[PDB]
Symmetry: D2
Subunit: 185 residues, 4 copies
C-alpha cells in the first residue's frame, strides 16, 4: 500500500480550462484591451482575492499605459444578496472621477457585487466602466450584467484554481479544475 505526500491534483476531477488555454485567451484579450485603451491610461481594478492571478497575466499581455489598483470588500450578511451592496474594506488609492475604469474579475456568477461596484463607480463619475472576466456563468445571474470581455463561458461546475478557491485553498493552481464531489460534499 503506497502512500505519498498529498498533492492538489488528487482533489481535481478534471481540468476544465488548461493553463495553455488560459494563456492563449489572455494573449487575445490583452491585445483587444490594448487596442481599446490605446489613447488613455485606464485604471485597471481587481477585487481581492480571486482576481489576482488573472489580472496579473492579463495586464502583462496588455501593451499600453495603465494604472492598477485594488479593492477589498466584505458581505453585510443576507442584504449583500439583494442589491449586492458590500462593505468597503479597502477603497481605491486614487479617485474615480473622470477615469476609464476596467474591472478585472475571475468569474461573474450572480453579478450582484460587481453590479454594485460598477454603479458605485458611475456614481463617483467614472468616465466609463467596463468589465473583463476570465470566466462567465450566465445562468447564475440574479441581476442583469453583461461583461464587456469574457474569456470563457462555463456551465454549472464547482470550479477551483487560477484564483478560485475552496476554503481559501487551490487559488494557486495554474489551471481551472472541477473539484471532486468528495472534497466538498
Amino acid at each position: 500500500y503506497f502512500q505519498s505526500n498529498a498533492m492538489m491534483n488528487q482533489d481535481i476531477e478534471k481540468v476544465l480550462i488548461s493553463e495553455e488555454q488560459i494563456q492563449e485567451k489572455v494573449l487575445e484579450l490583452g491585445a483587444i484591451i490594448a487596442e481599446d485603451y490605446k489613447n488613455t491610461v485606464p485604471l485597471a481594478i481587481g477585487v481581492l482575492k480571486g482576481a489576482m492571478p488573472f489580472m496579473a497575466d492579463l495586464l502583462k499581455r496588455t501593451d499600453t499605459y495603465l494604472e492598477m489598483d485594488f479593492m477589498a470588500v466584505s458581505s453585510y450578511g443576507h442584504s449583500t444578496v439583494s442589491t449586492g451592496e458590500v462593505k468597503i474594506l479597502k477603497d481605491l488609492d486614487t479617485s474615480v472621477e473622470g477615469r476609464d475604469i476596467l474591472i478585472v474579475e475571475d468569474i461573474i456568477d450572480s453579478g450582484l457585487t460587481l453590479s454594485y461596484l460598477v454603479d458605485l463607480f458611475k456614481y463617483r463619475k467614472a468616465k466609463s466602466v467596463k468589465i473583463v472576466t476570465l470566466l462567465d456563468k450566465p445562468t447564475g445571474r440574479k441581476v442583469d450584467l453583461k461583461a464587456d470581455y469574457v474569456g470563457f463561458t462555463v456551465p454549472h461546475e464547482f470550479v477551483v484554481g487560477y484564483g478560485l478557491d475552496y476554503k481559501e485553498q487551490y487559488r494557486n493552481l495554474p489551471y481551472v479544475g472541477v473539484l471532486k464531489p468528495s472534497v466538498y460534499s
Copy 2:
C-alpha cells in the same frame, strides 16, 4: 514627420531582467518553496500593489496547498521613512497566530517596511515568517534584514516593470527594465 500613439517600450533604456529570466527563476523558486512547505499549508501574503505580478507567477509554480492573503499599508510621513512603522489600511483576512507566513515581495531595498511587518507577524504569534523577493538591493538597507529566497540581486538601477512603477504606470510590463533618464528627470 509621422506621429502615432505612445508605446511603453520607447521609455525603456534597456531590459535589466527579461521575461524569460523571470520565468526560469520563478520556476526554480516555486519548486524550492513547494519543497520547504510540503507538510504545512502556509499563508502567502503580498503587500499591495507591487508584489502582485510576481506573487501570481510564483504561487502558480508552487505546487503545494497554501492560502493567499493581502495587506495594504500607507506611510505615516517621516516616521515611516525613519522606522518602518506603517498604517494598516487592509489587514489580513485571517489570523496570524500559529501560521507559517510567507511574505512575497517584488523588491527589498531599505528593508524598513518589511522588517516592521515581519516583527508585527511575530508579535501576532506566527509559527514562522519567511520572505521571498524577486529583487534584492542589499546596498540600500537601513536595517538588517535578509530575504530567505531571492530571485535576483540588483545593483544601482532605476527600475520599472513586473510590478515596479513610475508614477503608478509601467507595473504591467512583463520584464524589469531601466527607465530612460528623461522620463523621471
Copy 3:
C-alpha cells in the same frame, strides 16, 4: 519671572459658543430628532473624528431607539476639493439599503465631502438621509447643501473645541472658542 505648565485656555481669545449654550441646544435638537424618528430606528452616523463630542451628547439627549455607526475617510488630494469624492477608510458596519440615515456633523462649510456622502448613501438605497450639524458656515458653500438640523449658524471665525481641532489639539475643549491669531500664524 514665574513659569509653569501650559493651559489651553491661554490660547483661546474668546469663547464663541459656551458649554452652557451647547448643552441647551443639544437638549432642543435631541428632542426634535426623537420626535421626528419616533416610529423608526434610524442609523445615526458620525464621520471621524470631529463629530464625536457632538454626536455623543446629541444622541444621549435623543430618547428613541437608534443605532450608531461611524465612517473614516481621507482626501484624494486635488480631486476631493472639486467633487467631495473621498477615500473610504472605514465603511459602515451595517448596510444602508432601506434605512433612514442621520449624519451627525460638527460643522458644514464647503458642503463638498458631506454632499458626496449623502449621495453615496442614496446610491446605496437609503430610505432617507438627513443631516444634523452643530455648526453651520453657509457662506463657505462650494455646493448647494442645507442641513436639516442646525445648532448654530456661525460667521467667519477660526474655531476650535468640542470636536474642532488645530493640528489635532483642542478637540477636547467643552466649548467652541476662537483661537488667538498667534497660535496659527
Copy 4:
C-alpha cells in the same frame, strides 16, 4: 387598553449607574488624568463603537493638551478567543512610536482584545500605554489585565447604555442599565 409609543426605559430592569454618578466620576477621572499627563500631549485612543460616549465626556473634563484618535477592529472568529488577536479595520491616523497612549474604553470584561492592542502599541514603540475604563468586570478575565483608571467595578449584570449595546441599540442611553431578561432571553 392604554398602549403608548415604545420607549427604551420600558426594556430596562433597573439603572445600575446613573447619569449623575457617571458625570461625578468622569469629573474625577478627568482631573486625575489631566494631572498625570500635565507635561505631554498623549494620544487618547477609543475603539469603536462602545467607547464613544465615555471618551467624549471624559476628554472634555480633561483639561490638558491631547490628541484623539480611533480604531476599528473585527473578530477573526474562534482565534479571537485565545490571544485576543483581531483584524484591524481602521488603524490610527498617526504613528505610535514615542507616544504616550491612553486607551479609553467603556468596559473591560475578558480583557483579550485590549491586551492584544496594548501589546501591539508596545510593539509599535509607544513611550507608554495606559487604560482608563468606565466599567470593569474583573471576574470576566480570560487573560491578566488591570486598567490604570477605573470608573466602576460591576458584577455580572447584562448591561446596556452609555455606549453599551444590545443588538446595536441602547448605546444612546445617558445611564448604564440592566436589561430585562425578557428582552434578551
